[PDB]
Structures are given as C-alpha cells and as structure tokens.
C-alpha cells in the first residue's frame, strides 16, 4: 500500500503563456466523514486573499470554477461530471490558450473557462485536496 | 546539442504538446530549412499525417498518404528570425494541430489522418537543436 507521492498542498511558481499545459496525476482519498475535494488554483502569488484568476474545484460530481478579483469572488461557472471516479487514478489537464483554459480528464474534454484576469498575472500554481498527488508537470 | 535529425517515438492525444528549442543557422550557400514530421513510423515511405516545413519566410504543411502528398497549405511568416534562437510549439487538439513560434500563433492544420496513427516525431534542418520536449 506504499507509494511515492508529492506534498499536498503542492505549490509551483509558473509563468503562463498562450500555449501552456499543466498535467496532474492524482487519486481521490476516502476521508473520514466527507466526500473528497480537489482544488487547483492558478493564483497571483501575492499574499493571502490575493487575486486568483482561475480556481477549479471539484467534489462529488460537481465542478465549480471562479475568479477572485480584489477580494471578491465572481459568478460561478458550475457543471456536473462523472469524470472523477474514486478511487481510480485520474489525469487532469489544464490547457492555457489565448482565450480560455481548457480542462481535460483522462484525455476527455470536461469544460472551458474564459479568461477573466490576464493569464500573464498568474504566478503560482496550487494543487490540493483529499488526494494522493503523484505528479505535476508543465510545458 | 541534440542529434539532427532527431527521432522520438510518440503517442499523441487530444491534448498533447511538442516544444522545440533550436538556433537557426546561417549556412553560406542556401537559406536555412526546418522540417518537423508527425509520421506513422512504418518504414521509409510510410504515411506522414503532418509535415511542417519552413524556409525563407514560407511555411508549407501537407500530408503524405499512400505514397503521394496532398494539397499543400502554404503561408508566409516572419517569425523565424535568421540566426536567432526560436521556440516552436505544436499543440495537438481533437480537430487540428496549432503551431506557435516564440509564443505567437502562426498557423493551424486540420487533421487529415488520425492523430492516433502518429508514432514517430522527426525534427531536422539547418538548425542547432537544443531541446525537444513533449507532454
């Protein structure tokens, strides 16, 4: 039952471009008394409560995506998906393009998020949740 | 630097990226050439779903199927500055390859043969090839 994994939360300084990929490989846990959550922040890396151009949040069949701008969360983009089967390992991909982030799970497109803050203002990638995180790669 | 030509077995997906970093040379007696094959890896004459070729301000893209090339997609670009390092990206999506040079969109190539049939990446030309990465 031993397996190598990365720290959780996982932090990585980044500079996004118009053709940029994040690939996360992880598996949802079975936490005591709650459904496991997954959360990925493309954040500005300022202080606490600093801007978050793009947060991706998943729990129990539901994806919520939003933007934190000057202490204010915006209008949620919310959807249902069956892509995350606990406790099957999954591959979660974010593709940063000029117009939007594109999200894939296990090579299938799940959803897209139009940029609300400039992608150039993202400085910090933050991956956390009730997960065993095995790898995070960027290109 | 890396061998030139460069070969790497690959398996593409609907969200797949190739990033090439190279210095374009200044050969006396010709204009420098750059060629990237997304090929089937099935012998010397096998199908090539996507060839990207660049020389002297012109990009040509095409597909080799059953021993003959298709109808070209040709266009002009100034993105390759002679003698300068460049970064060339290929993004493989469900519908097309998207090409970027130094973080700028250059051109797109709709799939003509299945991306799943590409098995071999081939990078060559009048270049110093410093890195090839995929994800």
Numbering used by the authors:
A (entry chain A): -1 to 137
B (entry chain E): 3 to 137
From the study:
In animals, for instance, nematode larvae induce increased expression of galectin-11, which is produced by epithelial cells and secreted into the gut lumen, coinciding with an eosinophil-biased inflammatory response characteristically associated with larval infection(s). As a functional analogue of galectin-1, galectin-11 is proposed to cross-link glycans in mucus to form a physical barrier against the parasite(s), as part of a pronounced inflammatory response.
Through sedimentation velocity studies, we confirmed that the residue substitution in the dimer interface affects the homodimers and subsequent oligomerisation of LGALS-11. The c(s) distributions at concentrations of 0.10, 0.30 and 0.90 mg/ml showed that isoform 1 is represented by a tetramer at all concentrations tested (sedimentation coefficient: 4.0 S), whereas isoform 2 is in a monomer–dimer equilibrium (sedimentation coefficients: 1.64 S and 2.5 S, respectively). To verify the tetrameric organisation of isoform 1, we then mutated residues L9 and S11 to alanine, produced a recombinant dimerisation mutant (DI-m) protein and assessed the sedimentation velocity of this protein. This DI-m protein exists as a monomer–dimer equilibrium (sedimentation coefficients: 1.1 S (monomer) and 1.7 S (dimer), respectively), similar to isoform 2. No anti-parasitic activity was detected for isoform 2 or the dimerisation interface (DI-m) or carbohydrate recognition (CRD-m) mutant, indicating that extended oligomerisation or lattice formation via self-dimerisation and glycan recognition properties is critical for the anti-parasitic effect.
